[PDB]
Amino acid sequence: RESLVVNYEDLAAREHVLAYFLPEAPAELLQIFDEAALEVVLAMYPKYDRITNHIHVRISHLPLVEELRSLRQLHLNQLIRTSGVVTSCTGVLPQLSMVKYNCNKCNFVLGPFCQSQNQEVKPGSCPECQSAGPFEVNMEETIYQNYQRIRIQESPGKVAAGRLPRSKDAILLADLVDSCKPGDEIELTGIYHNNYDGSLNTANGFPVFATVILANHVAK
Amino acid sequence: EVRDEVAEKCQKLFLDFLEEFIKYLQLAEELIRPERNTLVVSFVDLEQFNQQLSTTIQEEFYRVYPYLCRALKTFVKDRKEIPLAKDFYVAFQDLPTRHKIRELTSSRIGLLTRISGQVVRTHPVHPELVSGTFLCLDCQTVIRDVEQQFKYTQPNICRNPVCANRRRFLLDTNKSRFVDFQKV
Amino acid sequence: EVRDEVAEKCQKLFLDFLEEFIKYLQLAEELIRPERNTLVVSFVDLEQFNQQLSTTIQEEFYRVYPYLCRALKTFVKDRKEIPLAKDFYVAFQDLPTRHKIRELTSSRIGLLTRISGQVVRTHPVHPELVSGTFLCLDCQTVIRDVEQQFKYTQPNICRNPVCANRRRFLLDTNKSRFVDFQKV
Ligand SMILES: [Zn+2]
Ligand SMILES: [Zn+2]
Ligand SMILES: [Zn+2]
User: Fold this and answer.
1) Are B82 and B30 contacting, i.e. CB atoms less than 8 angstroms apart?
2) CATH number, domain with residue C18
3) Backbone phi, then psi, for C26, in 5-degree steps?
4) Nearest-CA residue of chain A relative to C159?
5) Domain range for residue B32?
6) CA nearest B41: which of B8, B17, B11?
7) Quick check: A194 and B173 CB within 8 A?
8) Which member of A75, A156, B71, B175 has the lowest number of beta carbons within 10 Å of its beta carbon?
9) Strands B38-41 and C169-171, how do they pair?
10) Ligand nearest to the CA of B134
């Protein structure tokens, strides 16, 4: 397997500072924890360098966080936990990771570039012929990741009379893909995000931002 | 710089009103919690405290309100320790007059009105920009505190006299200022 | 990183020579003045102290000399308080052998030699670059400590993996490192 599960209760009991910093800085702390887990596992077994070069760390339990109604500006770039009902799924999609580019003037192969979730990767110039472009993706030598998108709606039983259920979007990656069927009830732990290109409304209307949740664990 | 006389007088008189006429200290005590941003003030108290101040605020609501917000911020900052990031707002309830929807005309733009209606639709909640920060793509100069009003407004001109750039900017969302938003 | 064994041994043995065989402490005492940069060391003292070290330095002068400079810098820094900006250099006088001008061949490149000649012309004095600092014109990255050797050398490649710029750079003369220069 490729994933490891960690409980927030034990993490807080053993090392309090990491638990305190966890909600308000999820991405970097998760990256550090992934590196530490990979180091420990590779110390335990040496063959994974052939099998799996990375291991994800997922948080299982947390103090339960408010429902979809309460999510506001205060929760941006934080760690949250929600419960809802799945309504649709996009299937499995191959996203880029460690992209290799072919120059179009010569045929040099530009080195791997890590694909961040916020912006697309735009290589500067070809290191040999110093051309500014254009570039295309080397399909054969690129590495790919599993990607899936989910829409979540409030459970109809918990909605107070006189108001309507509200919905939000979430994204599942790597081992989390195809872990939920539409019409099921799930609970997610994720990151409430803005910093992705295209979130700001610019063409017309007020300056309104769109929010997206990036999940890292699923509890039925 | 240039200052506004009416704004200064309104700030002073509203600080006097908040300090002298105290329910509002008790409400500022509640204002500590992160889920509270707005202070609710009864307008009949304004009428009793100073008819002149009430008339000025009614005739100059749009121009004066941001300065009353600053006065409230100073008041809560003096009474309690609150991070400077948070903002605060003022509200009024007990207007003694009503205006019909069709009675709203261009002469009333910017003043304080009260109407009646029936809700038909509500949109979801979103964050919004208030004051942005931009980076010039040519000379790498940082321009801060550009007011957005009611549209996505870029800086009018690069503050570098030699650059004079008005078309290419980047937005640093981390330094920006937000507020919640909903349409009905 | 990768280290050099011979350089480390030469540093250790030259520090031992400077600390054990003391005229050189008295000269480092003079080295405080701003008009002095070079330490003069007699080679017969090297021959007496360690024939092995003397042979290594003679056969590896070019490769070892910059590390002896660092050892001298550490010595003077330990003995006295001198700003880190200043550099220091080593000199040798009493070579027991001579070589004619025509005897200089390609096999002697990089070693320590001594010749005789007659001066014909002297050029004026100028400052020169030793280690430069450059700014990339595309991604605004700062590249420091590029060695110039004997030509105006730009950074080989921008240290940003995605940028890969090798043709457009600016030179910040303020952060740079200089040395006096004269031709004869
Ligand atoms: Zn190329
Ligand atoms: Zn500019
Ligand atoms: Zn660059």
Assistant:
1) no
2) 3.30.1640.10
3) -65, -35
4) A127
5) 5-91
6) B17
7) yes
8) A156
9) unpaired
10) 2
